[PDB]
């Protein structure tokens, strides 16, 4: 393959496309013999050179990595998420879909097809692996063999056209809670709220509209509510006609937080929209209710964090204003006005990729993990935020822990592994990929989840480099068809 | 896996164990659209940590790499050679066989089993892929799927216990010509000469004895003869009982060249042994007859080239005396004495891994390629000879060509690809793996075989590193079950 000599395709961003199997990877330290299951994660990774001769990171085809940890060892299985895009392009021997979220640039032969790369999450639910991209229904795969099934539309019961890549699992029921924005077509203001039972059946789909179409990438869930931030990374058909990146950031629009009842009978008038000044947030650590209040914890930045989705008024990207810090947004359902009850920064540590012990989804919670950018640390190699620490916040005491991966490495999203179903919150392990940039390889690190400063208790070496990852998740073996 | 922190297992020698598939590898330049077939090569690569807690490079399990070149692209498929050793150890989850060529160190559970790692050659003949190790019968594999068949003993017609990893194909018949030393058991002085027809049937097996047991790694073949150098890298049960490496070099023993008739009716008295002073040679570029003379071209060194098989009298390894240079050994079957007719250095370039256009096997020939060690070139990274150039010798004119891979890379064995069945000698391409040590990755280089100084016409990037390789070979698609 002839790929462009551009940053999105070179160095740490060289295409990989490795499908492989390696059991019993070389490792150091002690892999807890308690562990029996797998960590799935996804990297965008281009099957073919881009039609336009360049592209962005978020547009690579999804390649799924599974780390099966059992018997004190770690194995890897890596396979493509075989979306319809992947299949059509594979058969044609070339790219057929064009630029990111831009159907105007697709070959006529694939007009009308799902454009999903399934590249944003590798999530386990209902005995399946969900390879997810928020512009289409999710793809599903067999978590044991990593073969691909196809797109999930729930027996026809889903009529929205899209499905999130940030599903939540409500611990009170085991339901998957999901949204789909642009639900009636590209750039539309329609959103669906979906709930899926543990058996994988769609329980309900509820439609509503938002203040303006924007990237609704993530959201929170509580017992009673969908908690949906409206942040003006905006897109439009006009931008696409003009050849601009689908999304751009508008610093002049307000930010909203919508509180949407988790109810099949939802009507638009049931929704409350709280409004605040312009800012940026993408991911949700967790949300929860307290009395008549709703709290959501997000990495908040002053301005846009996506340089590739630039300021709509032509401002150059501002890295300083892109620094995000975990912040609690609180709104009171009993309040008279549409003002937030409070916005409270929870840490001065800058970071992203927030995670919790997912058994706490929607509940008051003590612990949060993030990838941290500590700009005070020495750096000799980079591979444009520098995510160089694992961070743990204790909301009960305020205490913070940090682990630095050293001056030639960076880190990918952590994921929490519970010791047992009814172990206390945070009792378990963190796993995360470490980019060993000087060695052009990756490690999988295993930490004691509440004692990270001493470093990983085990380091699994991969004999190749992973690419930049998006989201990932642990599942125990019994949830994924792997051996007891 | 917990591997030793020793040189044989770290850095460029880290275990890899990658089984993978990647079509359409990222590449630069122009892969000749004429090419349709595959280059197979083998790397020793340990499935498990060694029983003794250390080991040598030559003892890793064979991992087979196939580069399928077609339609102007290159694909990779990498699979284990599943020897009985591999299978038994895989089932046990641990090493069961011990040190190199040392059955005394094996677990009792595998006494009597073939110890082959099938790690020295990946050769195509009779519709099969031969994964070869000279201490056992060859393993065979399906060249298309790279599944393993098992050990080849030719329907019981082979009674020798071993088979070479340096088979030759006689162009006059298409027969495979092979030896097996230590043919009646470890360290024995019995050798078999085998010839196998193009259909894979054993034609004959002829037994003989040699002046002393030694590493009979390679040999030459001409129309009438097996040409067998006897070089005193010697082994014995006594060395193994004392815990020494199987082989050690004895500078006090003579070197012989045996001329053995290629005849099923061979008797010991039919063999002529020519004798010369101590020196070292391992590989054969080619051998051929001229009148009553036999010529064989070998990289000759003053002394041992294997630091891991040390001087039997305790001398430290001498790198200067280990420098090998292509040299013609000529013996006259009509001569009165046992002296060689001549020993003539053919180049001052130091090198190893000699190759020809294999259509010239046993015939007078014009071209030879080698890996060259040019100690005058700058080096910033190494990964203990530094093989940093591809070398081409023209025996007709004397002309030499060199291509240097640069200061942070090294090279693996080249292989010649003919343009067509009746293309002239040397009309075609050279392929070879390049270790890009600074990038911790490998390239496959494609050269115009007689115009190497301009550099490769195509460079295929692998998104991971291969390990040190041994021998490899090209076959056209029709010889290996791949698409026309
Ligand atoms: Co996300
Ligand atoms: Co050899």
Author numbering:
A (entry chain A), B (entry chain A): 2 to 384, 389 to 489
What does the paper say about this structure?
Lignostilbene-α,β-dioxygenases (LSDs) are iron-dependent oxygenases involved in the catabolism of lignin-derived stilbenes. LSD4 catalyzed the cleavage of DCA-S to 5-formylferulate and vanillin and cleaved lignostilbene and DCA-S (∼106 M−1 s−1) with tenfold greater specificity than pterostilbene and resveratrol.
Co-LSD4 was produced by growing cells producing LSD4 in a minimal medium supplemented with Ca2+, Mg2+, and Co2+ as the only divalent metal ions. Inductively coupled plasma–mass spectrometry (ICP-MS) analysis revealed that each protomer of Co-LSD4 contained 0.92 ± 0.06 equivalents of Co2+ and ∼0.02 equivalents of Fe2+. Finally, incubating lignostilbene with Co-LSD4 led to rates of O2 consumption that were barely above background. This is consistent with Co-LSD4 being inactive, with residual activity in the preparation the result of trace Fe-LSD4. Therefore, we prepared catalytically inactive Co-LSD4, a strategy that yielded ligand-bound structures of CAO1 (31, 32).
